[PDB]
Curated annotation (Swiss-Prot):
Component of the eIF4F complex, which composition varies with external and internal environmental conditions. It is composed of at least eIF4A (TIF1/TIF2), eIF4E (TIF45) and eIF4G (TIF4631 or TIF4632). Interacts with eIF4G1/TIF4631 and eIF4G2/TIF4632. TIF1 and TIF2 code for the same protein. Present with 106000 molecules/cell in log phase SD medium. Optimum pH is 6.0. ATP binds at A54, Q55, S56, G57, T58, G59, K60, T61. Keywords: Acetylation, ATP-binding, Cytoplasm, Helicase, Hydrolase, Initiation factor, Nucleotide-binding, Phosphoprotein, Protein biosynthesis, RNA-binding. A motif (DEAD box) lies at residues 148-151. ATP-dependent RNA helicase which is a subunit of the eIF4F complex involved in cap recognition and is required for mRNA binding to ribosome. In the current model of translation initiation, eIF4A unwinds RNA secondary structures in the 5'-UTR of mRNAs which is necessary to allow efficient binding of the small ribosomal subunit, and subsequent scanning for the initiator codon. It is found in: Cytoplasm. It comes from Saccharomyces cerevisiae (strain ATCC 204508 / S288c) (Baker's yeast). Belongs to the DEAD box helicase family. eIF4A subfamily. The lineage of its organism: Eukaryota, Fungi, Dikarya, Ascomycota, Saccharomycotina. Changing Q37E: Increases about 3-fold ATP binding but reduces about 2-fold ATPase activity in vitro. This is ATP-dependent RNA helicase eIF4A. The modification Phosphoserine is found at S65.
Length: 201
């Protein structure tokens, strides 16, 4: 584990999460934060752009799902977090988890594979870009942009769609990129859209 952020939290109780969220975490079966969640949840909540190389099954989904849910202003009924996955299956799965964690919260999650007042939007690059173009949902309230399995997405030709989505989002959007590998392409998006990112490898 290599990181340029040194805070390590061992219990979800210590992350100062909303209790309704915490209820959902424990309710989901999350007992102890994994290596990755021990280090990445906090910086994401704090607003840092975050780059994390994490293998699947290490608790990636929970990391950005918990941090995103903690950052939602439930009063605002519009997209605040946009999550991009390489496939419709992954996207569907992320929606499953987010909803389970948000069980004790009043949060609307919608998958792009209804959209106007969803607070969390999950989907594939092509579908999301198309819905933005046809103005199916506004992007002015988006505060978080999460790219799950970035190496997968950039290799499937979504690179251009992603670059375009970036430009269409508020210049102040926090960027969270998770990838198992570190292709030169991934480092590229990182240098182009992140500002002094927290790195966890």
């Amino acid at each position: 584990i290599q990181t340029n952020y040194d805070k390590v939290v061992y219990k979800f109780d210590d992350m100062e999460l909303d209790e309704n969220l915490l209820r959902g975490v424990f309710g989901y079966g999350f007992e102890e934060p994994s290596a990755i969640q021990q280090r990445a949840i906090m910086p994401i909540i704090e607003g840092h752009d975050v780059l994390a190389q994490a293998q699947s099954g290490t608790g990636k989904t929970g990391t950005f799902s918990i941090a995103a849910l903690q950052r939602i202003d439930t009063s605002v009924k519009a997209p605040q977090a946009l999550m991009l996955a390489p496939t419709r299956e992954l996207a569907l799965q992320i929606q499953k988890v987010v909803m389970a964690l948000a069980f004790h919260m009043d949060i609307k999650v919608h998958a792009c594979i209804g959209l106007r007042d969803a607070q969390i939007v999950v989907g594939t690059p092509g579908r999301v870009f198309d819905n933005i173009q046809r103005r199916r949902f506004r992007t002015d309230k988006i505060k978080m942009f999460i790219l799950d399995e970035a190496d997968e997405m950039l290799s499937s030709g979504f690179k251009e769609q992603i670059y375009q989505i970036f430009t269409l989002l508020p210049p102040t959007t926090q960027v969270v990129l998770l990838s198992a590998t570190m292709p030169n392409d991934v480092l590229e998006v990182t240098t182009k859209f992140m500002r002094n990112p927290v790195r966890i490898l």
